[PDB]
Amino acid sequence: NVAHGLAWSYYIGYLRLILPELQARIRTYNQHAVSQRLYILLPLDCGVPDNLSMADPNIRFLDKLPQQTGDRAGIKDRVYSNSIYELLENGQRAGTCVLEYATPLQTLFAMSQYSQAGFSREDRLEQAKLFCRTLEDILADAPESQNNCRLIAYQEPFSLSQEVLRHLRQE
Amino acid sequence: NVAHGLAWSYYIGYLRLILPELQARIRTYNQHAVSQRLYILLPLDCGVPDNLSMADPNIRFLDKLPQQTGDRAGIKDRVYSNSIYELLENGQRAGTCVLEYATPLQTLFAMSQYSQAGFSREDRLEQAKLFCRTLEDILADAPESQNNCRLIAYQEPFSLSQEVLRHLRQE
Numbered sequence: 333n334v335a336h337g338l339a340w341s342y343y344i345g346y347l348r349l350i351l352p353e354l355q356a357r358i359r360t361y362n363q364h365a366v367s368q369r370l371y372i373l374l375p376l377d378c379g380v381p382d383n384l385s386m387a388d389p390n391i392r393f394l395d396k397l398p399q400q401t402g403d404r405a406g407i408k409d410r411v412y413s414n415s416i417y418e419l420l421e422n423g424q425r426a427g428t429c430v431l432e433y434a435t436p437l438q439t440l441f442a443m444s445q446y447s448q449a450g451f452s453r454e455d456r457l458e459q460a461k462l463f464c465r466t467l468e469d470i471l472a473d474a475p476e477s478q479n480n481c482r483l484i485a486y487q488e489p490f491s492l493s494q495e496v497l498r499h500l501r502q503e
Numbered sequence: 504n505v506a507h508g509l510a511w512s513y514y515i516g517y518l519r520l521i522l523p524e525l526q527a528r529i530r531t532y533n534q535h536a537v538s539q540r541l542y543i544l545l546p547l548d549c550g551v552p553d554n555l556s557m558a559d560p561n562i563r564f565l566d567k568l569p570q571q572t573g574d575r576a577g578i579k580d581r582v583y584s585n586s587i588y589e590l591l592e593n594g595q596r597a598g599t600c601v602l603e604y605a606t607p608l609q610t611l612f613a614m615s616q617y618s619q620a621g622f623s624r625e626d627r628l629e630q631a632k633l634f635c636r637t638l639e640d641i642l643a644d645a646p647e648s649q650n651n652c653r654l655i656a657y658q659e660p661f662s663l664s665q666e667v668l669r670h671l672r673q674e
């Protein structure tokens with residue numbers, strides 16, 4: 333049950349901190365049109381690339397949001413930065429969103445390759461589902477999540493841009 | 504055993520990334536004298552303040568290291584920043600180090616206060632020791648730790664500056 337602690341740390345040390353300030357940062361970039369929610373990609377195979385634009389030709393990096401800084405555990409001005417992506421459909425700009433992967437899923441992957449971690453590669457999908465399940469239960473009861481965060485969990489046997497656009501059109 | 508996953512994520516998603524580049528960043532600040540190792544404070548009571556200078560009058564913030572950036576899980580130029588601190592002894596500058604707290608210990612604390620986390624406040628010291636024990640076993644076998652990281656675990660029943668200075672004088 334390693335994913336339980338990673339999901340609670342993903343909320344306490346990130347979502348609880350950036351989500352209350354996400355609406356003000358998006359409004360600052362819009363004025364001085366990006367959508368209002370932070371869209372988190374949760375691949376249940378834990379295949380998390382670092383270049384999201386290289387994972388889908390229809391997902392294109394656009395710009396960065398205004399940075400969020402704060403003193404965190406003795407580190408002065410710890411930077412919390414997020415990227416804005418454009419989603420294409422038949423060569424048409426179909427949406428603009430703050431998009432990123434669920435980083436602890438990447439840690440879950442590399443943890444399975446370290447023999448000292450005691451985490452078999454077979455349990456990767458099991459813990460990925462537990463991570464999404466735990467995070468869903470936290471955000472459903474979290475006051476910081478006020479229609480400003482959307483979890484996008486999927487299982488690739490496929491268009492990643494189409495999956496993001498379906499959640500984008502629900503708003 | 505929540506601390507097991509937090510310690511492995513503290514290494515995979517941080518120490519493995521910044522320690523290979525820490526020597527070059529310290530040499531850049533020195534030329535264009537800070538010590539060579541990253542000193543991590545691990546309070547076993549998990550009492551981690553955000554203002555380290557406010558936790559000890561003999562620990563004084565000095566400057567920031569050159570920032571380390573990198574594309575991480577769809578986030579372009581994720582910033583990894585570290586702070587340089589000065590340690591005083593009888594009003595004398597006794598040492599200069601890159602000092603910070605073990606952030607997952609702070610997450611371990613807040614996790615004990617959330618009722619949905621299923622983590623009792625009594626198990627805080629137990630998991631703090633497991634976190635330090637797990638991290639010690641990782642760094643002892645990690646190739647990225649080449650005499651560039653020093654764990655400072657302590658139990659306050661006391662001078663935090665004196666504890667850091669004792670490890671500082673060992674080098």
Ligand SMILES: [NH3+]c1ncnc2c1ncn2[C@@H]1O[C@@H]2CO[P@@](=O)(S)O[C@H]3[C@@H](F)[C@H](n4cnc5c([NH3+])ncnc54)O[C@@H]3COP(=O)(O)O[C@H]2[C@H]1F
Nearest residue numbers: 341342345346412435436439512513516517582583606607
């Ligand atoms: N720059 C820097 N400074 C100091 N310390 C660091 C550090 N980077 C890593 N660490 C240490 O390694 C742990 C695991 O990091 P990891 O990356 S695998 O997972 C994170 C991540 F998914 C999400 N998250 C938090 N901040 C985030 C930002 N800015 N962007 C995107 N996602 C973020 O929340 C998880 C828990 O973050 P945490 O702070 O509680 O624990 C961290 C921290 F203790």
